[PDB]
Paper text:
Yeast eIF3 engages 40S in a clamp-like manner, fully encircling 40S to position key initiation factors on opposite ends of the mRNA channel, providing a platform for the recruitment, assembly, and regulation of the translation initiation machinery.
Using the full [name] [name]-domain structure as a guide, N-terminal [name] truncations were generated to obtain crystals of a dimeric [name]/[name] assembly, encompassing the full predicted [name] domain of [name] (S. cer. residues 251–812) and residues 228–496 of [name]. As expected, the [name] domain of [name] shares the basic architecture of the fold but with a more elaborate helical domain that extends over 450 residues. The helical domain can be subdivided into two regions: helical-element 1 (HE-1) is composed of helices 1–7, whereas helical element 2 (HE-2) contains helices 9–13. HE-1 and HE-2 form TPR-like right-handed superhelices similar to those found in other [name] proteins, with the relative orientations of HE-1 and HE-2 defined by helix 8, which disrupts the helical repeat at the HE-1/HE-2 interface, inducing an almost 90° bend in the domain. An extensive, conserved protein segment formed by a 40 amino acid insertion between helices 13 and 17 meanders back into the HE-1/HE-2 interface to further stabilize the kink. The dimerization interface between [name] and [name] involves two distinct interaction regions. Helix 23 in the WHD of [name] engages the WHD of [name] in an arrangement similar to the Thp1-Sac3 [name]-dimer (Ellisdon et al., 2012). The second interaction interface between [name] and [name] involves a loop between helices 18 and 19 of [name] that engages a cleft formed by helices 11, 12, and 15 of [name], allowing a stacking interaction between residue F664 of [name] and Y257 of [name]. This interaction induces a rearrangement of up to 3 Å at the end of [name] helix 15 to accommodate the [name] loop.
Residue numbers in the entry:
A (entry chain A): 225 to 495
B (entry chain C): 251 to 794
């Protein structure tokens, strides 16, 4: 019975694996998620553990699913776990290693800023059961765990390390603008970049918003939009930028008042 | 003579015996039609031949296409014989007797409705068994399409039999009694279709009818007029208010409201409904007519929505669409699934007669998306107000509603890009909340259901507008906390709403909700942040 048991379990597990991969390739994300649950619990029960090809393709699917889910951390994690498995494969091209390391670092950059607390229960936390994560590895933790690892930092394209220098090495607003002018031209040449423009842009602009709230606390709006405006790929309609700020404000990063009668924005911090 | 009577009677007696070979009984009747020459022989042969077939296939799921197709041939042949006879088989009026040879059956009873009424019933079987096939075939197979091709030929027999009844019957009290039912069937076979398809069925029905005409509407002459179809419907409609059966009267009224709410203006339909006074009635008149009433409620809920009346729409549909079981309440459920449930078959006829064939179905996804779009436009600004800090207008607590499903989507561990239609509607709602109306329109146009409306472009832009308005409202409601002042010019440009609308909406809302907001029309600028609910409580504490 234990033989028939082990075999039937294996059948059912592979069955769910391809229900996941087919679902993802077929753009059904609910059946994909549900089948992924089914996979997780099965492996917890399973004695015989999966063959590496299937796990690699598993993370290959999980990266897409967690992309479109709106959670950058899980994305990043399954993308890492694809790396760790792919270094074992006989056909590995340096271009690919570079691409994937790069993309991991970007997904770390694209991550929304975890520093400002979330009041209440986040349902997304449950999903972390799936990847072994007990709680969210904050954008800091992600940056650390990424640059810490040899191969990852090692294979990253220079433009991206440069980006990390633009954003995270003593960031000053105007200087960041100027750096972005030159660096974006060199950056957009490479394939991986296409998908990350939006969350990246939002992160940048958030940083800009906070630095602007600290540096001058009462201003004309027309003066604010110039600073808030970014270069070519990150360009935004005026009101769109207004609402990026609005987002940041309702997120309680910056406590703001706005009087448009005089076209003024007033930052008052009285804590 | 006596050969014929004795044979026929032996057969009829043998039929009332349990063990019989029905194939052989049918074949015997037929082989004895071969011999018959005299017309009373023919007619009295057919009169027991038709039900002999129906009875033979009676205990099956339905009678198959071949046996049905040949029984049609039977009824059409009896009709051709009765037509070529021209009522002269009865020896006129003054002398009724059927005499030749009544002594052999000996069981004759004087009547017209009695001997010549049975005819209609035959036709009805043809129809009923026919429906039983459309329920039992696969909804998407080509076979279903062929059966539906047979529907027209049944409508033919309805009209023809009607016309023979008109020529024959000399007593108006009997003629009405006889005509009520085929008028009913005639209606059932028309109302759910387009004016075109109906006039097709009608034209086709009139082309197969010869020099015989007696009818009230007089269609043979007037066939081409555009007032034709409407006058047929309102004609039989007005007729059925005479009959004493209440289920028939309500039936008629409901067919009116359906057809009208489809091919005619909505207001007419509404007037009909409120004037017709059926409420305490409908509840007690069983299942099928309630399926019909829910069908017409749905239909006016739909056309009122085509008119871009949201407030009306949500008013209409809420009772029926709060039902979990709505698919069943609309009498659309696959027969098979409840065919296992309802067995035994004897009492299964009851539940199986309640569900409807496919071509008469109203796609549920269309209905649900419609109502949910409504409940969105309606409930979103009031919600936005409430949870962003203004509650003066809110005491809804919404049964089985868009808001509750919002509450359940927020609580999901996983949030996927929208796939099911309620998810697209959902994304449109959250989009409204954040104030991107463009995104919401995009997410709403990804819904497939909108393709089932012939006016779709019109309602696309109409909805785009109503959405522009309500999303402007929602925006204002949510963001008035961090804004002390606003610019009507910018707002107008960015929502793509001309200022006349903007100032109107905003002013009307602030005046209705008692919001501490001030507008200068001269400079077109707005003002807020005074407060509050709690500050009025501060004041109330301070005065006393």
């Amino acid at each position: 019975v234990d033989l028939s048991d082990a075999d039937t379990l294996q059948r059912y597990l592979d069955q769910r694996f391809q229900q996941v991969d087919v679902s993802v390739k077929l753009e059904l994300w609910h059946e994909a998620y549900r089948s992924i649950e089914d996979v997780f619990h099965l492996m917890k029960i399973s004695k015989r553990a999966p063959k590496p090809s299937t796990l690699a393709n598993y993370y290959e699917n999980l990266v897409k699913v967690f992309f479109v889910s709106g959670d950058p951390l899980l994305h990043t994690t399954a993308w890492k776990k694809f790396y760790k498995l792919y270094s074992t494969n006989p056909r590995a091209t340096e271009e690919e290693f570079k691409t994937y390391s790069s993309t991991i670092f970007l997904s770390a950059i694209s991550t929304q800023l975890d520093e400002i607390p979330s009041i209440g229960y986040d349902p997304h936390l449950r999903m972390y059961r799936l990847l072994n994560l007990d709680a969210k590895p904050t954008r800091k933790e992600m940056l650390q765990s990424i640059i810490e690892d040899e191969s990852i930092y090692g294979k990253v394209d220079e433009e991206l390390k440069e980006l990390y220098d633009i954003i995270e090495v003593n960031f000053d607003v105007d200087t960041v603008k100027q750096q972005l002018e030159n660096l974006l031209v060199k950056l957009s040449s490479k394939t991986y970049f296409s998908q990350y423009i939006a969350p990246l842009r939002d992160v940048i602009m958030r940083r800009v918003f906070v630095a602007a709230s600290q540096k001058f606390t009462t201003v004309s709006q027309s003066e604010l939009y110039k600073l808030a405006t970014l270069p070519a790929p990150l360009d935004l309609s005026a009101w769109d930028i207004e609402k990026s700020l609005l987002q940041a404000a309702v997120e309680d990063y910056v406590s703001i008042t706005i009087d448009h009668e005089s076209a003024k924005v007033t930052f008052a911090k009285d804590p | 003579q006596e050969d014929f009577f004795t044979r026929l009677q032996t057969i009829i007696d043998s039929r009332g015996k349990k063990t019989v070979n029905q194939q052989s009984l049918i074949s015997t009747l037929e082989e004895l039609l071969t011999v018959a020459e005299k017309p009373y022989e023919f007619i009295m042969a057919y009169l027991t031949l038709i039900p002999s077939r129906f009875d033979a296939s009676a205990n099956l799921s339905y009678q198959p296409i071949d046996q049905w197709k040949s029984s049609f041939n039977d009824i059409s042949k009896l009709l051709s014989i009765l037509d070529q006879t021209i009522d002269t088989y009865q020896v006129n009026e003054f002398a009724d007797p059927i005499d030749f040879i009544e002594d052999e059956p000996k069981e004759d009873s004087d009547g017209v409705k009695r001997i010549l009424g049975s005819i209609f019933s035959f036709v009805e079987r043809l129809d009923d068994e026919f429906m039983k096939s459309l329920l039992n075939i696969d909804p998407h197979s080509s076979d279903y399409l062929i059966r539906l091709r047979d529907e027209q030929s049944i409508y033919n027999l309805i009209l023809r039999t009607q016309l023979y009844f008109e020529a024959t019957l000399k007593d108006e009290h009997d003629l009405e009694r006889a005509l009520t039912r085929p008028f009913v069937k005639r209606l059932d076979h028309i109302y759910y279709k387009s004016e075109n398809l109906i006039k097709i069925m009608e034209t086709a029905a009139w082309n197969i009818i010869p020099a015989q005409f007696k009818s009230k509407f007089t269609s043979k002459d007037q066939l081409d007029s555009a007032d034709y179809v409407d006058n047929l419907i309102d004609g039989l409609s007005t007729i059925l208010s005479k009959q004493n059966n209440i289920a028939v009267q309500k039936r008629a009224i409901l067919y009116n409201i359906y057809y009208t709410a489809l091919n005619k203006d909505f207001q007419t339909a509404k007037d009909m409904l409120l004037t017709s006074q059926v409420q305490t009635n409908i509840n007690q008149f069983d299942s099928s007519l309630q399926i019909l009433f829910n069908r017409v409620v749905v239909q006016l809920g739909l056309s009122a929505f085509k008119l871009c009346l949201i407030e009306e729409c949500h008013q209409i549909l809420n009772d029926l669409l709060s039902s979990s079981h709505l698919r069943e309440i609309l009498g659309q459920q696959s027969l098979h699934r409840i065919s296992l449930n309802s067995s035994n078959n004897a009492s299964a006829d009851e539940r199986a007669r309640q569900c409807l064939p496919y071509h008469q179905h109203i796609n549920l996804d269309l209905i649900d998306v419609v109502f949910l779009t409504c409940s969105l436009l309606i409930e979103i600004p009031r919600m936005t107000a409430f949870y962003s800090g203004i509650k003066v207008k809110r005491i809804p607590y919404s049964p089985k509603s868009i808001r509750r499903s919002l509450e359940h989507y927020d609580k999901l561990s996983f949030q996927g890009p929208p796939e099911t239609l309620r998810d697209y509607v959902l994304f449109a709602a959250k989009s409204m909340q954040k104030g991107n109306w463009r995104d919401s329109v995009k997410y709403l146009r990804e819904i497939k259901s909108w393709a089932l409306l012939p006016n779709m472009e019109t309602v696309l832009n109409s909805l785009t507008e109503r959405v522009q308005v309500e999303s402007l409202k929602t925006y204002f409601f949510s963001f008035k906390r961090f804004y002390s002042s606003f610019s009507v010019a910018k707002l107008a440009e960015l929502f793509d709403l001309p200022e006349n609308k903007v100032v109107e909406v905003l002013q009307s809302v602030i005046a209705e909700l008692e919001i501490p907001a001030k507008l200068n029309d001269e400079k077109t600028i707005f003002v807020v942040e005074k407060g509050d609910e709690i500050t009025k409580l501060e004041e109330a504490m301070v005065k006393l």
